[PDB]
Amino acid sequence: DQANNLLIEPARIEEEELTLTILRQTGGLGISIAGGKGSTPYKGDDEGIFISRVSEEGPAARAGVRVGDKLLEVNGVALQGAEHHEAVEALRGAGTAVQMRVWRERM
Amino acid sequence: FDQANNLLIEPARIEEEELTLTILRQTGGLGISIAGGKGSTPYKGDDEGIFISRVSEEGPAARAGVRVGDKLLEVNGVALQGAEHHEAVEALRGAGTAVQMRVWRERM
Amino acid sequence: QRRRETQV
Amino acid sequence: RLQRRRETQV
Ligand SMILES: [Cl-]
Ligand SMILES: [Cl-]
Ligand SMILES: [Cl-]
Ligand SMILES: [Cl-]
């Protein structure tokens, strides 16, 4: 759209929180997690858990997971303050169906 | 935010920046890591450009002003636009003792 | 300076 | 070549 022949900024989604559900295949979720409290942040100074690599096709991609997503909850277990390895163990024992809440931003 | 006349307003922010930095090489190199390139998995978004991934703390690049996440645009007058990862590696390996780079920096 | 990344 | 994540210290 235009305003006196001057372009208008389009509608933008600055950030969103999604609830996704991954179905584990081959015993793996097809993602990589990086970061954790007490580790080098994955972005800025945010020490949370961030999805670093979404395997091509595979469980997480079909579920909607995307690189850069910050993992907030997993089957009702909040990850606030989790260290990398405490996040690893949470996602390894999450069972067949792993329901995730994530926070996504625009870049 | 900022406060002025009891109004909470958006602070002044630097969205994008282009900086020229000069790193001095030492024993062991420049103390950085580069990632990406044309034909490599992007380091950020769909951007196949070269970005600083690691800056050795208190190292040569740290003292020169480099910050993790900066996009490397030129090295000693040679632009890396469209360069493959390894082309950038050899460019930064052959830049000599003083490596003058123009980078692009985002906010968060 | 602990950079940690795992494949789950 | 493979479209893979690539990183090199310099
Ligand atoms: Cl949940
Ligand atoms: Cl970054
Ligand atoms: Cl230059
Ligand atoms: Cl050069």
How far is A90 from chain B, CA to nearest CA, in Å?
27
Among B97, B102, B100, CA closest to B25:
B97
Q: Searching chain A, which residue's CA lies closest to the CA of residue C1?
A: A40
Contact residues for A28 (Cβ-Cβ < 8 A; gap 6+): A59, C7, C8
A54 and chain C: CB distance < 8 Å anywhere? no
Vertex B23: Cα angle to B18 and B27 (nearest 5): 155
How far, in Å, are B25, B32, B84, D3, D9 from residue B62 at the CA level?
12, 9, 25, 30, 14
Q: How was this structure determined?
A: X-ray
User: Where are the domains positioned within chain A?
Assistant: 15-105
Counting other chains too, the contacts that B40-46 makes at CB distance below 8 Å and 24 or more residues apart are B40/B84, B40/B85, B40/D3, B40/D4, B40/D5, B40/D6, B41/D3, B41/D4, B41/D5, B41/D6, B44/A107, B44/B69, B45/A107
Reported resolution in A? 2.8
- The CATH superfamily label for domain B15-105 reads PDZ domain (2.30.42.10)
Enter the tokens of residue A17.
């929180």
Q: How far apart are CA B77 and CA A49, in angstroms?
A: 39
How many Cβ atoms are within 10 Å of A52's Cβ, its own excluded?
18
The A residues from 57 to 86 touching C (CB cutoff 8 Å) are: 84-85
Enter the tokens of residue A97.
């169906």
> Are B19 and B102 in contact, with CB atoms under 8 Å apart?
yes
Enter the tokens of residue A86.
């405490």
DSSP class of residue A30? Answer: S
Enter the tokens of residue B29.
């190199």
Q: How far apart are CA C5 and CA A33, in angstroms?
A: 6
Which residue is associated with the tokens 């991934």? B53
User: DSSP string spanning B74-96?
Assistant: EETTEE-TT--HHHHHHHHHSS-
> Are B106 and A43 in contact, with CB atoms under 8 Å apart?
no
Enter the tokens of residue B80.
């890396």
Q: Searching chain C, which residue's CA lies closest to the CA of residue A35?
A: C4
